[PDB]
């Protein structure tokens, strides 16, 4: 939900959310940026 509106042109997400996403992941999923990253990649890649 947060990835789709904070997306602009698909796989081009501004750092403001590149982290905001990573952090919500790092928070909601409690995934240390390590875990969060893999996810950030999948979300951006998929949501792209």
């Amino acid at each position: 939900a947060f990835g789709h509106k904070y997306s602009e042109e698909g796989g081009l997400i501004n750092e403001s959310l590149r982290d905001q996403l990573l952090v919500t992941i790092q928070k909601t999923f409690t995934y240390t940026r390590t875990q969060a990253q893999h996810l950030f990649i999948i979300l951006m890649e998929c949501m792209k």
């Binding site: 982290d19 905001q20 952090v23 919500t24 790092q26 928070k27």
Partner: peptide, 22 residues
């Protein structure tokens, strides 16, 4: 109240990012 809902969603995101920085 819809404007309250949108603004408080932004306030929670800013507070969460501030906690991660701290």
């Amino acid at each position: 109240l819809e404007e309250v809902n949108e603004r408080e969603h932004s306030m929670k995101a800013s507070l969460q990012t501030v906690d991660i920085r701290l």
